[PDB]
Structures are given as C-alpha cells and as structure tokens.
C-alpha cells in the first residue's frame, strides 16, 4: 500500500507540473505535494519502523 | 462510451469481485483495492485533457467521481472487515455477505438514474 502511493505520487508530480515553465522557485503546489509526499513516505516508514521495533 | 464509461464501469466491477475472496487474504484485497483506486486515479487525470480547463465540473466528472466513490467505499469495506476481525471476533462476515450483493445494487441504481437524466436532458 505505502509504496504503491508513494508511486502514484512521484507519478503525478510530472504530470501536473509539466503544463508550467520550468521556473526554479516553488509554486503552491510545490509545497502542498512535497507536504503531502512527507505524510506518505512517513506513512510507509512507519511500518518499517514497526518491523524494527518488532523484530529486536 | 468505449473510452471511459466502459474502463470506468470494469473498474467499479473489478473492486467488488474482492468481495468473494476469504477475509484473511489480506495481502490479494489490498492489491485489488489499491489497483483498483489507481485505475480510477488515472482514469481522472486522463479524461481532463479531451478538454480546455473549464472551471466546473461536467457529467462525465460526475460519473467519474461516482465510480472513484465506490472504488474508496470497496476499499474502506476491506480496511473495516480487517480492523474487525482482529478487534472483537464471527458474525463479521456477514458485512461481507451484505457488502457482496448491496454494492452492485447501489451502483446499478445509480447508472439507471444517471443514464435516465442525461438521455431525458
């Protein structure tokens, strides 16, 4: 599950940002898709991190 | 209707076909869910491009939205049997059992309005 979203997410940075210019700066929707890739790379780790805690 | 009702209704079909599977695969429900919401997902972004970004939503977002509804709502039903049947186990099956025939009566109701209105509009 986590890393399925994590690949829809990388997937559809591309597809959104590919109908603006390539400016260097950050858009809003920059920092609302890397906010919202923090919580899905958090929700996939947290599993891993369960795994470590389980198995120790 | 070949490009994206049929894709759209084959999806909402192919989450519910999960239903029949016993409750413990737990990792078999979760890929037909999972799969299922990408299909739909995907099937979002590529309807938007047949036109020019119009700020309002149009009947075939309606149908889309609808499906993607009841694409979430075969997950959530997963995630719920799952949740349960570690918590308090059993009688759970039996949202199963009623999930399994009341989802593609809800989603036939709704083509049978759908279709009426935008024929009769």
Same mark, same amino acid.
């Given at each position: 599950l986590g890393i399925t979203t994590v690949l829809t997410m990388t997937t559809i940075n591309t597809h959104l940002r590919?109908?603006?210019?390539?400016?260097p700066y950050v858009k809003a929707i920059d920092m609302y898709l890397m906010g919202c890739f923090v919580f899905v790379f958090l929700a996939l780790l947290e599993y891993a991190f369960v795994n470590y805690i389980f198995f120790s | 209707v070949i490009q994206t009702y049929l894709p759209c209704i084959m999806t909402v079909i192919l989450s519910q076909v999960?239903?029949? *599977?016993?409750?413990?695969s737990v990792p078999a429900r979760t890929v037909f869910g999972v799969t299922t919401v990408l299909t739909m997902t995907t099937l979002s972004i590529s309807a938007?491009?047949? *036109?020019?970004?119009?700020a309002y939503a149009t009947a075939m977002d309606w149908f889309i939205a609808v499906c993607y509804a009841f694409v979430f709502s075969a997950l959530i039903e997963f995630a719920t049997v799952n949740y349960f049947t570690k918590s308090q186990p059993a009688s759970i099956s039996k949202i199963d059992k009623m999930s399994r025939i009341v989802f593609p009566v809800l989603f036939g109701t709704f083509n049978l309005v759908y279709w009426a209105t935008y024929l009769n509009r």
């Open positions: 590919e109908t603006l210019p390539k400016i | 999960s239903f029949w *599977l016993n409750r413990e938007r491009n047949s *036109l020019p970004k119009v």
